[PDB]
Amino acid sequence: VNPTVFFDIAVDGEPLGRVSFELFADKVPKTAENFRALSTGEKGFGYKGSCFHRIIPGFMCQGGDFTRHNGTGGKSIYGEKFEDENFILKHTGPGILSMANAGPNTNGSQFFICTAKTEWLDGKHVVFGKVKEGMNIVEAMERFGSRNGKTSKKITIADCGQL
């Protein structure tokens, strides 16, 4: 079946709670595997200790830049970038997990958790999972965002792995 991965979220080092994601390996196996492996760290690098650098309430939470912590870095398990696998799945509402990118076929490690329906991203960003448990924790994280995306406290992935 599809893998489930968890993030344990901290706010300025204090524990907030746990989010778990279902990864749609049955429909986007290469994209799901990248996120899974970065969550376990099994390749020697990944998300543990990294931050959510951009949070816009009513839009999305963005993270995954574990090399420069500000949206300019990250890398995939396949190299610096990899292709758009397919666009079968759509941005249907809160909880959707989708890849950030900088143009066609530029996926790395950055991702965003949607907190609203974002249909204008359909066909441009690859959807590859959804929040399974802990959407309330995503809602709590949202409250530390701002209109321009800067967070008022440091939101980090204190631990992560596969359930």
Author numbering: 2 to 164
Task: Give verbatim lines from the article.
Here, we describe XFEL serial crystallography experiments and MicroED experiments using batch-grown microcrystals of the enzyme cyclophilin A (CypA).
This device relies upon the principle of electrospinning to break the surface tension of the crystal slurry and drive it into a microjet as it exits the tip of a capillary. In the case of our CypA crystals, the dihedral space group symmetry prevents the crystals from having a dipole moment that could cause them to assume a preferred orientation in the electric field introduced by the MESH injector. Furthermore, CypA’s structure did not appear to be significantly perturbed by either the electric field within the MESH jet, or by the high pressures within the LCP injector used for the LCP and Cellulose datasets (**[Fig fig3]**).
